[PDB]
């Protein structure tokens, strides 16, 4: 069976500085790949690197990138072209319409219509093959771009070969950076030209300059096919040499049917049946997307060993390692989602984690491809805690416990999201205050406090001293210094105990990131009942969740001085105050089931999944994020979420299709029967697990794993007295 017919690439690919749908590009690539390719509309360094609204293909990229705010690393590209030879990545474009364009994740096609040229590629994780069919013509040509801030390259025509290195990068590389790539084509050169700066120079060989490029060239009659097998690597030239034969000699053809046989193998772990095309195609895109970041950054030596070059401290390593995510993004869904259903990838990644920590001194938290100013929190300790209590466990338990502990007492002197910014005062008031200058504070302590309960979970477990595991209980608590009974809601707090004034909870950014205070405020993942126990009570907790939809999105920007693109997606949803690309929000509306009132939770999260994503180039409300606001779609239309990540449960929703079969590692399979499912049946009458009625808002990591039969009976009617008793409830650690 096939699933990679439902995957668009292009989804997201409409999208503005001013609006994102996404903001992605088509990620041709295996699973994971350590190297992507991309069609590039966009100029050279321009994060908007392929928009849907583009005319024009300047080249075909190789890419690392993760998003166009963090931008790109090890980045090269190669450009068909007729008629003149030249280099200018403006001269040397050309139209094309997405009508004469084909994007799988395994296999792109696009026909340049100014030079009358057909390309194809096929990548493999760290090579790709093309395939230019070239017309008639004296003057066919294959420009090589090493892109600028000092690149290398050279020709070497006795072996119908381009080799090159390209070190253009936005920062989080050590000194010695470098992508090595080698190109070898399969029909000899009549024409050869490297490029310095600008200038084509006919029969040099060899340039090391800022920005180095060749092009070689051909005769070429009518159709002629002409192929380059490409490899790089970020060890050594000799490595590229090795990561090339991931090719072979295949054709095209072979490779596409290889790269399509890979992603059926990972999509097809998840078989969803009884929907509509749309929902095919937002299901398996938003798959797709999360099965790419972070990428493999480790390559294969001569023994088919892993080693990696290290983006941290610039030796070559033995070793798995992988990078490209931002842990607050992806500690949500995305990587529970690996721990569910590709629990052996996500071993590698944990693996690499470890890795980081002795290269680096510190877990990372946004890491492109070394450690990167961004967002905040120290959300590794739930990316490290879950998979470990999922039974994804490193080897070496005893540096991953002394690399939490680490980061909860010191930060980056370079990076100041990695480790914790404001653990000073946050250890010392139990908050990061407001008036400290340390921007976002209340998001920082809200995450940190959810944090140490990660940490506390694991000393438990670990049979640490009874003295660390209160110390990290008493942490876990923090958020409550935060709460403000007089709004109701989460607010930042002066240095001396007093509360900001004036205070308002329109206010993005400031004490909060992305969002705010009617965004952050539920960031309570493991202790919800906690929150519940102080906004009122539960129904007043309810009345609270329930105003987020009906607040008008009136908001304050000053502490950015301009509408950033987040909040203009929250006013045109219409949708209140509920902005679904806000990532903090992302869980909230599962917390109606913590209320007892999971008949709001299965109304609301209908409508996100029917509103919100749409299958189309514009398909997402938000940016995507490497996996998170996709893999968000997946859980929710399977009908459940890791709202806590660190417990072993997935908490209720509503499912999107009539049936879904859960493929584990293990060898198991779960079925989701929920036959009456449809537009308007999106309520949950009862469900029962393997016989058994299952009455409760949650359902646990080894059961699932069990396999079986869940059956769900759907309904146009809420059902009010089913998972409002106290035993129904998920996890709260004030009820532990
Ligand atoms: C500099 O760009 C970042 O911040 C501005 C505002 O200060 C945002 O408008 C912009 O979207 C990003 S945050 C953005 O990118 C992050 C890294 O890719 C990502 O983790 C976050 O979820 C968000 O999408
Ligand atoms: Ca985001």
Redesign the pocket.
Known sequence: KDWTQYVNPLMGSQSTFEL?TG?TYPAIARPWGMNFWTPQTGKMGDGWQYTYTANKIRGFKQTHQ?????NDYGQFSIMPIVGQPVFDEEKRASWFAHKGEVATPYYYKVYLAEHDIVTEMTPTERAVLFRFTFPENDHSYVVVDAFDKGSYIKIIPEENKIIGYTTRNSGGVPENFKNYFIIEFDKPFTYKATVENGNLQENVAEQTTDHAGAIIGFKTRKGEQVNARIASSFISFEQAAANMNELGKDNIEQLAQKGKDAWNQVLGKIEVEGGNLDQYRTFYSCLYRSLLFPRKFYELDANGQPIHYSPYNGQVLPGYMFTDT?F??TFRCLFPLLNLMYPSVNKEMQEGLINTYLESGFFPE?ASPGHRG??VGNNSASILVDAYMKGVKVDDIKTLYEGLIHGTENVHPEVSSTGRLGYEYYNKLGYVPYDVKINENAARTLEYAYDDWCIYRLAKELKRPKKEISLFAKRAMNYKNLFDKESKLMRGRNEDGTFQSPFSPLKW?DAFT?GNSWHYTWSVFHDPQGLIDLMGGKEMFVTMMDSVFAVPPIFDDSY?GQV???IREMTVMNMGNYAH?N?PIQHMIYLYDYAGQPWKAQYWLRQVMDRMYTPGPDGYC??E??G?TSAWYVFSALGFYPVCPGTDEYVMGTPLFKKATLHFENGNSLVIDAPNNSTENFYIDSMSFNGADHTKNYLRHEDLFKGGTIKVDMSNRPNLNRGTKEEDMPYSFSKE
Request: with cysteine.
């Open positions: 994102s903001n993760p998003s166009p705010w963090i931002g607050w993004d946004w961004c967002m950014g992305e950015y950033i693109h987040e690309g990532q938000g940016d994020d490497n998170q």
